[PDB]
Amino acid sequence: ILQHPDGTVLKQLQPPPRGPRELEFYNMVYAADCFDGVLLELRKYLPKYYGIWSPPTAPNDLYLKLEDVTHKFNKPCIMDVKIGQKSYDPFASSEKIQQQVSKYPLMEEIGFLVLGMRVYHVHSDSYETENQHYGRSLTKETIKDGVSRFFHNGYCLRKDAVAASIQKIEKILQWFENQKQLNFYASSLLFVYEGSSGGEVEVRMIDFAHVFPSNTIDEGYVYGLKHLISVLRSILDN
Ligand SMILES: O=c1c(O)c(-c2ccc(O)cc2)oc2cc(O)cc(O)c12
Known part of the structure:
Protein backbone atom coordinates (compact mmCIF):
# COMPACT_ATOMS: atom_id res chain seq x y z
CA ILE A 1 0.00 0.00 0.00
CA VAL A 69 -8.61 5.07 6.50
CA THR A 70 -5.86 5.92 9.06
CA HIS A 71 -5.70 9.63 8.04
CA LYS A 72 -7.61 11.11 11.01
CA PHE A 73 -5.48 9.24 13.60
CA ASN A 74 -2.32 10.44 15.35
CA LYS A 75 -0.86 7.07 16.37
CA PRO A 76 -3.10 4.64 14.50
CA CYS A 77 -3.29 1.05 15.76
CA ILE A 78 -4.23 -1.11 12.78
CA MET A 79 -5.41 -4.69 12.47
CA ASP A 80 -6.30 -6.49 9.22
CA VAL A 81 -8.65 -9.50 9.61
CA LYS A 82 -9.61 -11.77 6.70
CA ILE A 83 -13.28 -12.80 6.99
CA GLY A 84 -15.13 -15.99 5.95
CA GLN A 85 -15.00 -19.80 6.04
CA LYS A 86 -13.48 -20.13 2.60
CA SER A 87 -10.55 -18.06 1.29
CA TYR A 88 -10.96 -19.63 -2.18
CA ASP A 89 -13.68 -18.58 -4.60
CA PRO A 90 -16.48 -20.55 -6.35
CA PHE A 91 -14.35 -21.23 -9.49
CA ALA A 92 -11.09 -22.24 -7.82
CA SER A 93 -9.41 -25.43 -9.09
CA SER A 94 -8.68 -28.41 -6.80
CA GLU A 95 -5.06 -27.22 -6.45
CA LYS A 96 -6.15 -23.63 -5.70
CA ILE A 97 -8.58 -24.81 -3.00
CA GLN A 98 -5.80 -26.87 -1.44
CA GLN A 99 -3.39 -23.91 -1.74
CA GLN A 100 -5.87 -21.64 0.07
CA VAL A 101 -7.00 -24.10 2.74
CA SER A 102 -3.36 -25.04 3.52
CA LYS A 103 -2.50 -21.35 4.18
CA TYR A 104 -4.84 -21.57 7.18
CA PRO A 105 -6.73 -24.87 7.66
CA LEU A 106 -8.78 -23.47 10.59
CA MET A 107 -10.57 -20.94 8.35
CA GLU A 108 -13.73 -23.09 8.17
CA GLU A 109 -13.75 -23.55 11.96
CA ILE A 110 -12.90 -19.98 13.09
CA GLY A 111 -14.33 -17.95 10.16
CA PHE A 112 -11.59 -15.32 10.32
CA LEU A 113 -7.83 -14.90 10.17
CA VAL A 114 -5.67 -12.07 11.52
CA LEU A 115 -3.45 -10.96 8.60
CA GLY A 116 -1.43 -8.56 10.74
CA MET A 117 -1.44 -5.83 13.33
CA ARG A 118 0.51 -2.73 14.19
CA VAL A 119 0.05 -1.63 17.81
CA TYR A 120 1.38 1.61 19.33
CA HIS A 121 2.82 1.23 22.81
CA VAL A 122 2.60 4.37 24.96
CA HIS A 123 5.35 3.70 27.51
CA SER A 124 8.00 2.85 24.85
CA ASP A 125 6.80 5.36 22.15
CA SER A 126 6.99 2.61 19.53
CA TYR A 127 5.06 0.15 17.41
CA GLU A 128 4.93 -3.64 17.79
CA THR A 129 4.07 -5.35 14.48
CA GLU A 130 2.74 -8.86 13.81
CA ASN A 131 3.03 -10.46 10.34
CA GLN A 132 0.84 -13.11 8.59
CA HIS A 133 2.43 -15.98 10.58
CA TYR A 134 1.05 -14.55 13.83
CA GLY A 135 -2.60 -15.01 12.78
CA ARG A 136 -1.89 -18.31 11.00
CA SER A 137 -0.54 -19.69 14.32
CA LEU A 138 -3.77 -18.98 16.24
CA THR A 139 -6.09 -21.84 17.20
CA LYS A 140 -9.53 -22.04 18.85
CA GLU A 141 -7.65 -22.18 22.18
CA THR A 142 -5.55 -19.03 21.46
CA ILE A 143 -7.75 -16.83 19.20
CA LYS A 144 -9.24 -14.71 22.01
CA ASP A 145 -5.79 -13.82 23.45
CA GLY A 146 -4.46 -13.45 19.89
CA VAL A 147 -7.08 -10.82 19.05
CA SER A 148 -6.74 -9.22 22.53
CA ARG A 149 -3.10 -8.28 21.80
CA PHE A 150 -4.32 -5.66 19.29
CA PHE A 151 -6.07 -3.76 22.08
CA HIS A 152 -3.09 -3.81 24.56
CA ASN A 153 -1.23 -0.49 24.73
CA GLY A 154 1.10 -2.01 27.37
CA TYR A 155 -0.68 -0.44 30.39
CA CYS A 156 -4.41 -1.17 29.76
CA LEU A 157 -6.71 -3.30 27.64
CA ARG A 158 -8.59 -0.80 25.45
CA LYS A 159 -12.11 -2.12 26.10
CA ASP A 160 -13.46 1.16 24.63
CA ALA A 161 -11.91 0.24 21.25
CA VAL A 162 -13.18 -3.35 21.64
CA ALA A 163 -16.78 -2.21 22.29
CA ALA A 164 -16.70 0.37 19.47
CA SER A 165 -15.36 -2.34 17.09
CA ILE A 166 -18.27 -4.62 17.98
CA GLN A 167 -20.71 -1.74 17.33
CA LYS A 168 -19.12 -0.95 13.92
CA ILE A 169 -18.96 -4.64 12.88
CA GLU A 170 -22.63 -5.06 13.82
CA LYS A 171 -23.58 -2.45 11.15
CA ILE A 172 -21.55 -4.35 8.54
CA LEU A 173 -23.23 -7.58 9.71
CA GLN A 174 -26.62 -5.90 9.29
CA TRP A 175 -25.67 -4.94 5.71
CA PHE A 176 -24.78 -8.61 4.96
CA GLU A 177 -28.09 -9.83 6.45
CA ASN A 178 -29.99 -7.51 4.09
CA GLN A 179 -28.29 -8.44 0.79
CA LYS A 180 -28.29 -11.59 -1.40
CA GLN A 181 -26.41 -10.25 -4.45
CA LEU A 182 -22.68 -10.37 -3.49
CA ASN A 183 -20.50 -13.07 -1.91
CA PHE A 184 -17.03 -12.08 -0.66
CA TYR A 185 -14.07 -14.47 -0.46
CA ALA A 186 -10.65 -13.57 0.94
CA SER A 187 -11.89 -10.06 1.81
CA SER A 188 -10.83 -8.27 5.01
CA LEU A 189 -11.78 -5.85 7.73
CA LEU A 190 -9.34 -3.10 8.60
CA PHE A 191 -9.63 -1.98 12.23
CA VAL A 192 -8.10 1.31 13.33
CA TYR A 193 -8.11 2.96 16.74
CA GLU A 194 -6.20 5.84 18.29
CA GLY A 195 -3.10 4.71 20.20
CA SER A 196 -1.78 8.08 21.47
CA SER A 197 -11.78 7.35 23.58
CA GLY A 198 -14.35 5.09 21.79
CA GLY A 199 -13.34 7.33 19.93
CA GLU A 200 -11.88 7.27 16.72
CA VAL A 201 -12.44 3.60 15.81
CA GLU A 202 -12.63 2.83 12.10
CA VAL A 203 -13.74 -0.52 10.66
CA ARG A 204 -13.71 -0.77 6.86
CA MET A 205 -14.05 -3.58 4.36
CA ILE A 206 -11.13 -4.04 1.95
CA ASP A 207 -9.65 -6.58 -0.54
CA PHE A 208 -12.16 -7.27 -3.29
CA ALA A 209 -10.34 -9.50 -5.84
CA HIS A 210 -12.76 -12.39 -5.10
CA VAL A 211 -16.25 -10.85 -4.87
CA PHE A 212 -18.81 -12.65 -7.00
CA PRO A 213 -22.49 -12.24 -7.92
CA SER A 214 -24.73 -14.48 -5.83
CA ASN A 215 -28.35 -15.49 -5.22
CA THR A 216 -27.88 -16.20 -1.47
CA ILE A 217 -26.74 -14.79 1.84
CA ASP A 218 -22.97 -14.81 2.20
CA GLU A 219 -23.14 -17.47 4.93
CA GLY A 220 -19.39 -17.81 5.44
CA TYR A 221 -18.91 -14.06 5.84
CA VAL A 222 -21.81 -13.84 8.30
CA TYR A 223 -20.38 -16.78 10.33
CA GLY A 224 -16.99 -15.05 10.49
CA LEU A 225 -18.42 -11.69 11.58
CA LYS A 226 -20.57 -13.36 14.23
CA HIS A 227 -17.64 -15.35 15.57
CA LEU A 228 -15.44 -12.23 15.55
CA ILE A 229 -18.18 -10.29 17.46
CA SER A 230 -18.38 -13.15 20.03
CA VAL A 231 -14.58 -13.15 20.53
CA LEU A 232 -14.51 -9.36 20.96
CA ARG A 233 -17.50 -9.61 23.33
CA SER A 234 -15.64 -12.16 25.50
CA ILE A 235 -12.64 -9.74 25.67
CA LEU A 236 -14.97 -7.20 27.34
CA ASP A 237 -15.16 -9.64 30.32
CA ASN A 238 -11.35 -9.71 30.86
O1 LIG B 1 -6.52 3.18 3.77
C1 LIG B 1 -5.86 2.12 3.82
C2 LIG B 1 -4.76 1.98 4.79
O2 LIG B 1 -4.49 3.04 5.57
C3 LIG B 1 -4.00 0.69 4.84
C4 LIG B 1 -2.87 0.40 5.77
C5 LIG B 1 -2.13 1.39 6.43
C6 LIG B 1 -1.10 1.03 7.30
C7 LIG B 1 -0.80 -0.30 7.52
O3 LIG B 1 0.20 -0.65 8.37
C8 LIG B 1 -1.54 -1.30 6.88
C9 LIG B 1 -2.57 -0.95 6.02
O4 LIG B 1 -4.36 -0.33 3.99
C10 LIG B 1 -5.37 -0.26 3.07
C11 LIG B 1 -5.65 -1.34 2.24
C12 LIG B 1 -6.68 -1.27 1.31
O5 LIG B 1 -6.92 -2.34 0.51
C13 LIG B 1 -7.46 -0.12 1.15
C14 LIG B 1 -7.24 1.00 1.94
O6 LIG B 1 -8.00 2.10 1.81
C15 LIG B 1 -6.17 0.97 2.94
Whole structure:
Protein backbone atom coordinates (compact mmCIF):
# COMPACT_ATOMS: atom_id res chain seq x y z
CA ILE A 1 0.00 0.00 0.00
CA LEU A 2 1.40 3.38 -0.88
CA GLN A 3 0.48 6.03 1.62
CA HIS A 4 0.37 9.45 0.00
CA PRO A 5 0.36 12.66 2.21
CA ASP A 6 -2.98 14.08 0.87
CA GLY A 7 -4.94 11.48 2.93
CA THR A 8 -5.14 8.82 0.19
CA VAL A 9 -3.43 5.60 -0.64
CA LEU A 10 -2.63 3.86 -3.90
CA LYS A 11 -3.26 0.15 -4.03
CA GLN A 12 -1.52 -1.51 -6.96
CA LEU A 13 -3.75 -3.91 -8.90
CA GLN A 14 -2.84 -7.52 -8.15
CA PRO A 15 -1.84 -9.56 -11.22
CA PRO A 16 -4.75 -10.78 -13.37
CA PRO A 17 -7.37 -12.02 -12.80
CA ARG A 18 -7.33 -10.57 -9.24
CA GLY A 19 -6.50 -6.87 -9.86
CA PRO A 20 -8.94 -6.50 -12.77
CA ARG A 21 -11.70 -8.07 -10.63
CA GLU A 22 -10.97 -5.69 -7.73
CA LEU A 23 -11.06 -2.74 -10.15
CA GLU A 24 -14.46 -3.84 -11.48
CA PHE A 25 -15.83 -4.27 -7.96
CA TYR A 26 -14.92 -0.69 -6.96
CA ASN A 27 -16.32 0.53 -10.33
CA MET A 28 -19.63 -1.30 -9.82
CA VAL A 29 -20.11 -0.08 -6.22
CA TYR A 30 -19.12 3.56 -6.90
CA ALA A 31 -20.80 3.89 -10.33
CA ALA A 32 -22.09 7.49 -10.36
CA ASP A 33 -25.41 6.39 -11.92
CA CYS A 34 -25.91 3.59 -9.34
CA PHE A 35 -29.14 3.89 -7.33
CA ASP A 36 -29.14 0.31 -5.98
CA GLY A 37 -29.84 0.81 -2.24
CA VAL A 38 -27.70 -2.20 -1.29
CA LEU A 39 -24.65 -0.77 -3.10
CA LEU A 40 -25.21 2.81 -1.88
CA GLU A 41 -25.26 1.49 1.73
CA LEU A 42 -22.12 -0.62 1.08
CA ARG A 43 -20.18 2.58 0.23
CA LYS A 44 -20.30 3.60 3.91
CA TYR A 45 -18.14 0.58 4.88
CA LEU A 46 -15.49 0.78 2.14
CA PRO A 47 -12.65 3.26 1.66
CA LYS A 48 -13.92 6.15 -0.48
CA TYR A 49 -12.94 5.31 -4.07
CA TYR A 50 -11.44 7.97 -6.38
CA GLY A 51 -11.11 5.85 -9.50
CA ILE A 52 -8.29 4.12 -11.29
CA TRP A 53 -4.93 5.89 -11.16
CA SER A 54 -1.65 5.43 -13.03
CA PRO A 55 1.56 7.50 -13.10
CA PRO A 56 1.55 10.31 -15.78
CA THR A 57 4.40 8.60 -17.68
CA ALA A 58 3.25 4.98 -17.12
CA PRO A 59 -0.37 4.09 -18.19
CA ASN A 60 0.70 0.41 -17.85
CA ASP A 61 1.05 0.74 -14.04
CA LEU A 62 -2.48 0.40 -12.57
CA TYR A 63 -3.60 1.49 -9.05
CA LEU A 64 -6.76 2.13 -7.15
CA LYS A 65 -6.85 5.56 -5.54
CA LEU A 66 -8.48 5.03 -2.17
CA GLU A 67 -9.20 6.93 1.05
CA ASP A 68 -6.50 6.50 3.68
CA VAL A 69 -8.61 5.07 6.50
CA THR A 70 -5.86 5.92 9.06
CA HIS A 71 -5.70 9.63 8.04
CA LYS A 72 -7.61 11.11 11.01
CA PHE A 73 -5.48 9.24 13.60
CA ASN A 74 -2.32 10.44 15.35
CA LYS A 75 -0.86 7.07 16.37
CA PRO A 76 -3.10 4.64 14.50
CA CYS A 77 -3.29 1.05 15.76
CA ILE A 78 -4.23 -1.11 12.78
CA MET A 79 -5.41 -4.69 12.47
CA ASP A 80 -6.30 -6.49 9.22
CA VAL A 81 -8.65 -9.50 9.61
CA LYS A 82 -9.61 -11.77 6.70
CA ILE A 83 -13.28 -12.80 6.99
CA GLY A 84 -15.13 -15.99 5.95
CA GLN A 85 -15.00 -19.80 6.04
CA LYS A 86 -13.48 -20.13 2.60
CA SER A 87 -10.55 -18.06 1.29
CA TYR A 88 -10.96 -19.63 -2.18
CA ASP A 89 -13.68 -18.58 -4.60
CA PRO A 90 -16.48 -20.55 -6.35
CA PHE A 91 -14.35 -21.23 -9.49
CA ALA A 92 -11.09 -22.24 -7.82
CA SER A 93 -9.41 -25.43 -9.09
CA SER A 94 -8.68 -28.41 -6.80
CA GLU A 95 -5.06 -27.22 -6.45
CA LYS A 96 -6.15 -23.63 -5.70
CA ILE A 97 -8.58 -24.81 -3.00
CA GLN A 98 -5.80 -26.87 -1.44
CA GLN A 99 -3.39 -23.91 -1.74
CA GLN A 100 -5.87 -21.64 0.07
CA VAL A 101 -7.00 -24.10 2.74
CA SER A 102 -3.36 -25.04 3.52
CA LYS A 103 -2.50 -21.35 4.18
CA TYR A 104 -4.84 -21.57 7.18
CA PRO A 105 -6.73 -24.87 7.66
CA LEU A 106 -8.78 -23.47 10.59
CA MET A 107 -10.57 -20.94 8.35
CA GLU A 108 -13.73 -23.09 8.17
CA GLU A 109 -13.75 -23.55 11.96
CA ILE A 110 -12.90 -19.98 13.09
CA GLY A 111 -14.33 -17.95 10.16
CA PHE A 112 -11.59 -15.32 10.32
CA LEU A 113 -7.83 -14.90 10.17
CA VAL A 114 -5.67 -12.07 11.52
CA LEU A 115 -3.45 -10.96 8.60
CA GLY A 116 -1.43 -8.56 10.74
CA MET A 117 -1.44 -5.83 13.33
CA ARG A 118 0.51 -2.73 14.19
CA VAL A 119 0.05 -1.63 17.81
CA TYR A 120 1.38 1.61 19.33
CA HIS A 121 2.82 1.23 22.81
CA VAL A 122 2.60 4.37 24.96
CA HIS A 123 5.35 3.70 27.51
CA SER A 124 8.00 2.85 24.85
CA ASP A 125 6.80 5.36 22.15
CA SER A 126 6.99 2.61 19.53
CA TYR A 127 5.06 0.15 17.41
CA GLU A 128 4.93 -3.64 17.79
CA THR A 129 4.07 -5.35 14.48
CA GLU A 130 2.74 -8.86 13.81
CA ASN A 131 3.03 -10.46 10.34
CA GLN A 132 0.84 -13.11 8.59
CA HIS A 133 2.43 -15.98 10.58
CA TYR A 134 1.05 -14.55 13.83
CA GLY A 135 -2.60 -15.01 12.78
CA ARG A 136 -1.89 -18.31 11.00
CA SER A 137 -0.54 -19.69 14.32
CA LEU A 138 -3.77 -18.98 16.24
CA THR A 139 -6.09 -21.84 17.20
CA LYS A 140 -9.53 -22.04 18.85
CA GLU A 141 -7.65 -22.18 22.18
CA THR A 142 -5.55 -19.03 21.46
CA ILE A 143 -7.75 -16.83 19.20
CA LYS A 144 -9.24 -14.71 22.01
CA ASP A 145 -5.79 -13.82 23.45
CA GLY A 146 -4.46 -13.45 19.89
CA VAL A 147 -7.08 -10.82 19.05
CA SER A 148 -6.74 -9.22 22.53
CA ARG A 149 -3.10 -8.28 21.80
CA PHE A 150 -4.32 -5.66 19.29
CA PHE A 151 -6.07 -3.76 22.08
CA HIS A 152 -3.09 -3.81 24.56
CA ASN A 153 -1.23 -0.49 24.73
CA GLY A 154 1.10 -2.01 27.37
CA TYR A 155 -0.68 -0.44 30.39
CA CYS A 156 -4.41 -1.17 29.76
CA LEU A 157 -6.71 -3.30 27.64
CA ARG A 158 -8.59 -0.80 25.45
CA LYS A 159 -12.11 -2.12 26.10
CA ASP A 160 -13.46 1.16 24.63
CA ALA A 161 -11.91 0.24 21.25
CA VAL A 162 -13.18 -3.35 21.64
CA ALA A 163 -16.78 -2.21 22.29
CA ALA A 164 -16.70 0.37 19.47
CA SER A 165 -15.36 -2.34 17.09
CA ILE A 166 -18.27 -4.62 17.98
CA GLN A 167 -20.71 -1.74 17.33
CA LYS A 168 -19.12 -0.95 13.92
CA ILE A 169 -18.96 -4.64 12.88
CA GLU A 170 -22.63 -5.06 13.82
CA LYS A 171 -23.58 -2.45 11.15
CA ILE A 172 -21.55 -4.35 8.54
CA LEU A 173 -23.23 -7.58 9.71
CA GLN A 174 -26.62 -5.90 9.29
CA TRP A 175 -25.67 -4.94 5.71
CA PHE A 176 -24.78 -8.61 4.96
CA GLU A 177 -28.09 -9.83 6.45
CA ASN A 178 -29.99 -7.51 4.09
CA GLN A 179 -28.29 -8.44 0.79
CA LYS A 180 -28.29 -11.59 -1.40
CA GLN A 181 -26.41 -10.25 -4.45
CA LEU A 182 -22.68 -10.37 -3.49
CA ASN A 183 -20.50 -13.07 -1.91
CA PHE A 184 -17.03 -12.08 -0.66
CA TYR A 185 -14.07 -14.47 -0.46
CA ALA A 186 -10.65 -13.57 0.94
CA SER A 187 -11.89 -10.06 1.81
CA SER A 188 -10.83 -8.27 5.01
CA LEU A 189 -11.78 -5.85 7.73
CA LEU A 190 -9.34 -3.10 8.60
CA PHE A 191 -9.63 -1.98 12.23
CA VAL A 192 -8.10 1.31 13.33
CA TYR A 193 -8.11 2.96 16.74
CA GLU A 194 -6.20 5.84 18.29
CA GLY A 195 -3.10 4.71 20.20
CA SER A 196 -1.78 8.08 21.47
CA SER A 197 -11.78 7.35 23.58
CA GLY A 198 -14.35 5.09 21.79
CA GLY A 199 -13.34 7.33 19.93
CA GLU A 200 -11.88 7.27 16.72
CA VAL A 201 -12.44 3.60 15.81
CA GLU A 202 -12.63 2.83 12.10
CA VAL A 203 -13.74 -0.52 10.66
CA ARG A 204 -13.71 -0.77 6.86
CA MET A 205 -14.05 -3.58 4.36
CA ILE A 206 -11.13 -4.04 1.95
CA ASP A 207 -9.65 -6.58 -0.54
CA PHE A 208 -12.16 -7.27 -3.29
CA ALA A 209 -10.34 -9.50 -5.84
CA HIS A 210 -12.76 -12.39 -5.10
CA VAL A 211 -16.25 -10.85 -4.87
CA PHE A 212 -18.81 -12.65 -7.00
CA PRO A 213 -22.49 -12.24 -7.92
CA SER A 214 -24.73 -14.48 -5.83
CA ASN A 215 -28.35 -15.49 -5.22
CA THR A 216 -27.88 -16.20 -1.47
CA ILE A 217 -26.74 -14.79 1.84
CA ASP A 218 -22.97 -14.81 2.20
CA GLU A 219 -23.14 -17.47 4.93
CA GLY A 220 -19.39 -17.81 5.44
CA TYR A 221 -18.91 -14.06 5.84
CA VAL A 222 -21.81 -13.84 8.30
CA TYR A 223 -20.38 -16.78 10.33
CA GLY A 224 -16.99 -15.05 10.49
CA LEU A 225 -18.42 -11.69 11.58
CA LYS A 226 -20.57 -13.36 14.23
CA HIS A 227 -17.64 -15.35 15.57
CA LEU A 228 -15.44 -12.23 15.55
CA ILE A 229 -18.18 -10.29 17.46
CA SER A 230 -18.38 -13.15 20.03
CA VAL A 231 -14.58 -13.15 20.53
CA LEU A 232 -14.51 -9.36 20.96
CA ARG A 233 -17.50 -9.61 23.33
CA SER A 234 -15.64 -12.16 25.50
CA ILE A 235 -12.64 -9.74 25.67
CA LEU A 236 -14.97 -7.20 27.34
CA ASP A 237 -15.16 -9.64 30.32
CA ASN A 238 -11.35 -9.71 30.86
O1 LIG B 1 -6.52 3.18 3.77
C1 LIG B 1 -5.86 2.12 3.82
C2 LIG B 1 -4.76 1.98 4.79
O2 LIG B 1 -4.49 3.04 5.57
C3 LIG B 1 -4.00 0.69 4.84
C4 LIG B 1 -2.87 0.40 5.77
C5 LIG B 1 -2.13 1.39 6.43
C6 LIG B 1 -1.10 1.03 7.30
C7 LIG B 1 -0.80 -0.30 7.52
O3 LIG B 1 0.20 -0.65 8.37
C8 LIG B 1 -1.54 -1.30 6.88
C9 LIG B 1 -2.57 -0.95 6.02
O4 LIG B 1 -4.36 -0.33 3.99
C10 LIG B 1 -5.37 -0.26 3.07
C11 LIG B 1 -5.65 -1.34 2.24
C12 LIG B 1 -6.68 -1.27 1.31
O5 LIG B 1 -6.92 -2.34 0.51
C13 LIG B 1 -7.46 -0.12 1.15
C14 LIG B 1 -7.24 1.00 1.94
O6 LIG B 1 -8.00 2.10 1.81
C15 LIG B 1 -6.17 0.97 2.94
